[PDB]
């Protein structure tokens, strides 16, 4: 990693009498100082780490007896978008999310967690089922945008996403969505129209990639660090704007360092947010979501 260059130079000299003790103590504090005080672009590379925990990593630690359900009753089962039904402290729930892949070969299988339009329709189907049986819906956002190109658009990628947006808007069941990887604009919002939205402290949420922003606005792609800082894509940035409802703590170094530690934190959030929404009935919870997204944005009358 880029910002681990100083940490690399410290432990390079220790692996060559009294220096060793002081350097190793010095490593302890500096490693903390760095990971405790993170710059926005440091957070973007942490979220892009191949080893960052995927949805299927988190589920077993959070939900009891999770059963994957496949397909869109239409065209295909999208590897990149998984879903199913399980339990959360006794109560049946539906779970949905983008699946990033763990190793190289597995990334190829999952199309890096970029959903085709069949993925969004599969997500929709499952949420309609949840609404039907009154199950809460948890979604996991982890995508660098929806799968682009002719083939994708040729099967209604625009429409797959837009339909989700309008159906999610009026879901008469609680929806809680959480960003664990990147939050690729519309691909992310396609399963992100939630009553409460949560983010991992080192995850991303944005209309475009900083590299995209750089090639369009800065007219030079090799300027993504600055674009990212300008774009305000960090968990904290988004929290200040009132777009998300909370930021979850992350283990030192990144969520990938300790999956179980991280997964327990997601459950405590899931549980606590879900308890907000118990007062709300089937009509009232739809209205709650309406009132969240209706009131986002700033203008001058």
């Amino acid at each position: 990693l880029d910002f681990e260059k100083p940490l690399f130079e410290i432990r390079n000299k220790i692996e060559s009498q009294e220096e060793i003790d002081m350097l190793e103590a010095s490593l302890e504090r500096e490693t903390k100082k760095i990971y405790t005080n993170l710059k926005p672009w440091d957070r973007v590379q942490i979220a892009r780490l191949q080893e960052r925990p995927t949805t299927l990593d988190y589920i077993p630690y959070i939900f009891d007896s999770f059963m994957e359900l496949h397909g869109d009753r239409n065209f295909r089962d999208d590897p990149a978008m998984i879903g199913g039904i399980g339990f959360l402290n006794g109560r049946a729930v539906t779970v949905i999310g983008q699946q990033r892949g763990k190793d190289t070969k597995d990334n190829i299988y999952r199309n890096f967690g970029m959903a085709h339009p069949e993925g969004y329709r599969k997500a929709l189907r499952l949420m309609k089922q949840a609404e039907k049986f009154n199950r809460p819906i948890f979604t996991f956002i982890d995508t660098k945008g929806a799968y682009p190109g002719k083939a994708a658009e040729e099967r209604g990628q625009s429409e797959s996403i837009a339909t989700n947006l309008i159906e999610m808007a009026s879901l008469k069941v609680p929806v809680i969505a959480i960003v664990i990887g990147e939050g690729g604009s519309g691909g992310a919002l396609g399963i992100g129209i939630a009553n409460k939205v949560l983010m991992l402290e080192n995850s991303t949420y944005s209309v475009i990639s900083p590299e995209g922003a750089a090639a369009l606005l800065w007219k030079d792609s090799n300027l993504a660090k600055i674009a990212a800082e300008t774009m305000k894509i960090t968990a904290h940035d988004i929290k200040q704007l009132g777009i998300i409802d909370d930021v979850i703590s992350e283990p030192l170094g990144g969520a990938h360092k300790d999956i179980e530690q991280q997964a327990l934190a997601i459950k405590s959030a899931f549980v606590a947010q879900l308890d907000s929404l118990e007062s709300l009935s089937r009509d009232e919870i739809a209205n709650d979501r309406f009132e969240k997204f209706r009131n986002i944005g700033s203008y001058i009358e």
């Binding site: 625009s158 947006l165 009026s170 519309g186 919002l189 129209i193 944005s206 090639a215 009131n295 203008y299």
Partner: protein, 250 residues
């Protein structure tokens, strides 16, 4: 007083071109129609009311040179922002309308566009009026970042409430309709209409290339299931007229 046709390069006398609804006489190419023109081209004379005529943008993310880039387009266009909204009538039948104008910041959707589209959608909902939207856009306005994204949600929410009241929403996709806009309200009409040779897609080649290192035409989208009708502009008025009449609350 002259506008050149980009397709066939033949020069024309704007007066008559406007009376042909900006359709090229020679090659039939459909030139862009400004918001107030579009509105005139479909509404009964003197029946238009404009909602939120003077709502300007602001700068939440403090994006550099954003507010001045807005002036450049206000001064050049005459519009306060890239969407004109209000109510009108067509052959005696009232309807709310939101025409997007792609000269003003490529018709990109920021907070103002979301709020104005919601305010009209929400008006129609109260008064049970069909609502008609003309999309023309390059996607989300990157200068307001995540807020521009959330406009996709903000709009959808008003639209679905409007739909749940049993009210007609016609999506009229004009050249060009792309990105967040096509991935939001532009795709979800009860009836989806477009125009010959209009360019409709999702992610652009510049975005898709950096984000992860004629199929966009309206006629192609109709073959591939996504449009109810490709409407020549000579049949626009009549087409919209009949649609509203069928959906007239008896």
């Amino acid at each position: 007083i002259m506008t050149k046709c980009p397709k066939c390069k033949k020069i024309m006398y704007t007066k008559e071109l406007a009376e042909n609804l900006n359709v090229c006489f020679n090659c039939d190419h459909h030139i862009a129609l400004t918001a107030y023109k579009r509105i005139e081209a479909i509404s009964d004379e003197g029946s238009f009311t404009e909602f939120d005529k003077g709502m300007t943008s602001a700068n939440p993310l403090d994006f550099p040179s954003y507010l001045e880039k807005i002036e450049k387009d206000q001064q050049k266009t005459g519009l306060k922002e890239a969407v004109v909204t209000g109510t009108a009538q067509l052959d005696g039948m009232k309807f709310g309308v939101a025409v997007m104008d792609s000269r003003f910041r490529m018709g990109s959707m920021g907070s103002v566009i979301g709020e104005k589209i919601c305010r009209i959608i929400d008006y129609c909902t109260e008064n049970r009026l069909p609502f008609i939207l003309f999309s023309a856009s390059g996607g989300a306005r990157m200068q307001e970042g995540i807020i521009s994204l959330m406009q996709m949600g903000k709009t959808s929410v008003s639209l679905k409430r409007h739909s749940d009241a049993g009210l007609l929403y016609i999506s009229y996709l004009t050249h060009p309709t792309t990105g967040g806009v096509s991935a939001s309200f532009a795709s979800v009409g009860d009836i989806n209409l477009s125009e010959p040779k209009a360019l409709i897609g999702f992610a652009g080649r510049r975005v898709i290339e950096q984000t992860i290192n004629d199929f966009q035409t309206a006629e192609f989208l109709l073959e591939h299931g996504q449009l109810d009708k490709v409407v020549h502009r000579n049949d626009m008025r009549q087409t919209l007229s009949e649609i509203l009449k069928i959906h007239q609350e008896v």
